[PDB]
Design a protein around this ligand. Structure first.
Ligand SMILES: O=C(O)c1scc2c1OCCO2
Length: 119
């Protein structure tokens, strides 16, 4: 029932993601010199360093907000990919499964703790 526990749990999950080779294309903002049409397809770029910095700045109020930004990294990869068999998109799918598998309990514990607070 710790309402604040999600933050360190998300920090640790981000550390695991950064160690994962599958996160390499997503660690920093997509290089617009390497992909000049990126902003023609993608309205809101997102990457893991931006997620970590937002968390560390105290700019997420809940793990659901962090989850929305991480999911945006994956949906941007899906929208930008020229193929569902592309290398970078395939890395995003594996990383998304890993993230969803690990974020589930963080969200559940947070929601449980908030419900206990409001009881
Ligand atoms: O070049 C590709 O196949 C892909 S698939 C997703 C991407 C990307 O390149 C830039 C980052 O997002």
């Amino acid at each position: 029932y710790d309402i604040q526990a999600w933050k360190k749990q998300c920090e640790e999950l981000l550390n695991l993601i950064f160690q994962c080779e599958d996160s390499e294309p997503f660690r920093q903002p997509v290089d617009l010199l390497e992909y000049p049409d990126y902003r023609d397809i993608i309205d809101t770029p997102m990457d893991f360093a931006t997620v970590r910095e937002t968390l560390e700045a105290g700019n997420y109020e809940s793990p659901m907000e962090l989850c929305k930004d991480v999911r945006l990294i994956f949906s941007n990869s899906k929208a930008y990919t020229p193929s569902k068999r592309s290398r970078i998109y395939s890395m995003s799918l594996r990383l998304s499964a890993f993230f969803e598998e690990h974020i589930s309990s963080v969200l559940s514990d947070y929601k449980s703790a908030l419900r206990f607070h409001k009881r």
